[model samples]
Target: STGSATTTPIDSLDDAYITPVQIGTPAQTLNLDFDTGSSDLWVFSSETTASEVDGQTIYTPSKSTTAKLLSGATWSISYGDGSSSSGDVYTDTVSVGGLTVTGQAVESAKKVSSSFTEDSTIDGLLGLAFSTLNTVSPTQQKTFFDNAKASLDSPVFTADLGYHAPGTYNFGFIDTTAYTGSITYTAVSTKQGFWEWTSTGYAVGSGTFKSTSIDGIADTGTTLLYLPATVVSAYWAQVSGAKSSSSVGGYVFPCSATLPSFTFGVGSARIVIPGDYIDFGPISTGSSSCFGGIQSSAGIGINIFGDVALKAAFVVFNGATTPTLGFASK
Candidate 1:
């Protein structure tokens, strides 16, 4: 039984990528953000009634020869942030790079507000992360993941973020070329359906101040990693010349020097974060106060490892083989 002891574990299967489809027609194209935190795939549609849609290239199903609309059904997404919109469901042969996947479920948001309507570059979003993490479930809908599982190259879907310019986001394949060491996996809770983890500490760039006591979860839905207050105060102490800046939405920081590297430890697994994402946007309330990656969520149950922190890794949420989430390199 010990001669070779060779077996190809399921996780070792070859990986492939499904890049997001540029939604607009031949005339216009825009980069859309894929959020697993929400369930609906919405782009600024030509059919969307508005004074003037944001700068994004609106996706008009009329232009798509293969577009098909679901019969008389209404879909709306309301978030914890109190933003909401409703629209009709449609299907089309979406174009992603060169591949065309038919019968793709897409939505068009009606009555978008100035916030979403004014964004010219990023006009819309596609929620393709997890089926169970949907924002709207009137009939308890199974989202894009549930609908497209059988057709994907693998049952696993991954997110590989392009560092800065153009900010490429790849899906369907987990590229392992960009990281060190082996990947880790843990089964997700059936109730929550989200793959969560408990962390040991967070460090910001060669700093002595570290939170040895905080434990938190990594969430794809979160835009930024919201850390605790005590942890933030201690961490901000380490960055030498980092200063705070203010914005309309929230707090941000402008550093005089390149910030040091920051890392989070889970037991011994250290997750390194990039310097660009290390500094948070300044809060609107305070002019001189720099925003911390770890926000004051003392009353909230867990800290969120948001998109900024996650861009540093080749992330895979492998739901096919028992609910285990995997992270590798790009």
Candidate 2:
């Protein structure tokens, strides 16, 4: 069995990608962020405070006959930025594209952070990293991918994120047409509950590849590519006017600056990110200072190969026994 869904960018900066998901008997289609960095299928719901609802859609459990309250089950999730959401749990019929799961644990939000409340483009999040990351107290739950993988042709899902466009998310099988090169598989560490992998160094523009091991997580939940300070500095230094600004936050440069293409490796596979891809957009409306899509992950502790990096290549999250991750060029 297989499922296919179109994931679209919500903002011009491509800050996030959202996919349409069915969440009940009647099929409440909510636009959600399918994050591969965490494990909790949570949603904004009727339970969310009215004042905090903003312009987002809400999932009402009472409206779904298939919905059943998971007695005494509750969850709380947080991010590196300190944003969070707390809620109760319910079992319901859920589906993505055509793949269906009859008894999926759906965590409904009662309270969400100010950042989530303000971002009305996304109504919920469907985490796909690993089930062990679930924050539900008492009995934890499996991720949507985990539950659906049972009957799938293969226990895998692939992400093909686009730049200022919509991309495809395919489950069960790999669509060979999506990429141009043969995939190079790599080991993944689930110890941190993430799709963690090590990159085989990087090169600036057309420069020679450097030999260094940079461990990072392939996180779709995060907006930008965060690497060690050394690499980040090396890349930005080539941008004539680029400078790290503490007040403006992170690195910023003139929109007119010429950005060099960045190339990183997975063993011997080289994934190149176009110069234009790293210059997200102007920091604010009509401003010449643009924020970079790549930043230093030093302060955050763990390096993150976020959407900025993932979108540059096709990524396969292999959930096979003794899991591994695969990357291919397009």
Candidate 3:
């Protein structure tokens, strides 16, 4: 949610801050999101009427001396979380970490909510995905990294989602010092708006989730893992000793007792979601039950992995070339 005007925060987001960086000749700030699920750059703009967006900060390209208009094209985007906003187009010189690029197209979104505005701390988003989701021309869905590829020193880009520590966003480079000298690179089949993968199955406590191979996608835009009903029910049944029931939007289970680790086996990468994240005790509603990271979403063929899974690995967004996402160690 960087390079935009309105900033919104996810429900469980904390200790995250926007860093001041250069985008071009003109200095612009960006808020980094761990999003690989979609590929569209967006931002809040001054052109948006007050009725259109309430709490978001709108950037007036006019406010910048080096700004220019890309075109008169307007756009509106709606996400899976039901958050929607609209905006206009403009071109400006953006400098990210001394890398200057000019005539870069920017979408200024208007009509965003206060909660969305307050949390994200920026107005728009700079999408870092493949051509499948790019907002540029039909023949050109290229990403920001694609355009900035020549300026970057390294051929790769990586991210260390330091949720508990100093969470820093790295661009055009990966800090080899942060890892344990080994990183597993998982090739993915980018589809359904994300780099999709198959979880050979999982285990909740003592039971094995047989035949539960799920096509899962990672999304930093969302804070929770919206899993399939079968998986969710099986997980809750084994852990909470309760069946699926409506407690808070999805399957609610008794969160008492020692919660077990939920394991996801995607080939060799067996990602374990710790028990602390599974014990969803108290939330916004004050309802104490199974309120962990995994939840049930209706009409679902997609399992969106959120921050809970990301915390375990040093996630990478290597978008300098044909965008690739992988995980390393901390």
Candidate 4:
């Protein structure tokens, strides 16, 4: 059997794409961010402190007959952006799209950082990375995908992220109509608990493509693309008015300035991010400056192919013995 679901971009942030998921016997529906960078299925719930919950929807485990507490089990996670959450554990029925998994581990947040509290629309995070990355202590938990994969026709999923448009996340099947051209497949190295791959090379718009190997992860949870400082600098050099802004943080260019298209190489696959897409909106409404969607990956250490980069291509996260990434134009 197979399943699929459409994901909608958060209206205001436009930084994350989320999908609806059902948990518990009575079906507590929650909108969760499908993040590929980490592994943990956590949600705001009765366990969360009342003041910390804010406008977020909370899942009440006591109300669900299927919910079983995992006594003494707990989890805590911190994101690169400094957002964090710590919670207790429960085993409950979890379903996504038309697929269902029995006894799925669900973390009920008891404490959430200000970043999460402020984003009231997002109920929680659903991590899709390898189970090894799961944050649960004592016994790490398997992701919903992992638990449901054995029952699927194929253990694979596709990410179709769009810019200011709705996309889809397909499980157990691949829809050819969703993408154009033959998908270029590249071997994925899962040693990092990420869908990491080596990029063949890259170049600024209309420039000759170079042949340099860059290792990076395809992370849907992150909002912007990050590369080595040298590579980021080279791309910004092509923008006439672009410069690093201390106050704005990262590189910024005039709102009206034209940006060069950026390209990344994956084997023979080259995904080109449109020039307009590089402008990550203005620093402030009516401001003359705009923040860039691509920046330095210095502090982060690992290069990240975030939403900005993922939106440029239709991606297949192949969960086979030898995992691979298939990419094609959207």
Report each candidate's C-alpha RMSD, comma-separated, in the order given. 8.5, 0.7, 4.4, 1.1
What is the TM-score of each predicted model, taking all chains together? 0.75, 0.99, 0.80, 0.97
Alpha-carbon lDDT, every model? 0.54, 0.93, 0.58, 0.90
**Per-residue lDDT for 18-52 in model 4, tens only?**
89999998999998999999999999999898888
Could you tally the backbone clashes for each prediction? 16, 0, 33, 0
Superposition TM-score, candidate 2 onto the true structure: 0.99
Question: Model 3 residue 20 lDDT?
Answer: 40
Task: Give the Cα-based TM-score of candidate 4 against the true structure.
Answer: 0.97
TM-score of 3: 0.80
Residue 104, candidate 2: Cα error in Å is: 0.7
Runs of candidate 3 exceeding 4 Å displacement? 1-34, 52-55, 97-100, 113-122, 136-141, 164-166, 191-193, 205-213, 241-243, 254-258, 279-285, 319-324
Over 4 Å off, model 1: 1-30, 80-82, 98-100, 135-141, 166-168, 207-222, 239-254, 280-294, 298-302
Better of 2 and 3 by lDDT: 2
* Better candidate number, 1 or 4, judged by TM-score: 4
lDDT of 2 by residue, 259-322 (tens): 8999999998899999888987888889999999889998999999999889999999999988
List model 3 lDDT by residue over 150-269, tens digit each: 667665545445443445556666667766635656556665547666667777755664645677776656666777776777676666455455545655556455666687665555
Model 4 spans with C-alpha error above 4 angstroms: none
Ranking of all candidate structures by their TM-score, best first? 2, 4, 3, 1
Candidate 4 RMSD to the correct structure: 1.1
lDDT of 1 by residue, 1-330 (tens): 000011111111111111235443442343455555566676678778867574556678877666777666567776544556667767665544443445656677776766566545555666654556554434334555556556666666565554342233333455566456767664445354445655667776765535475544445545566677666555555566443333433324453435556677645556677666555543433545445453445545666666656666666667575766555433
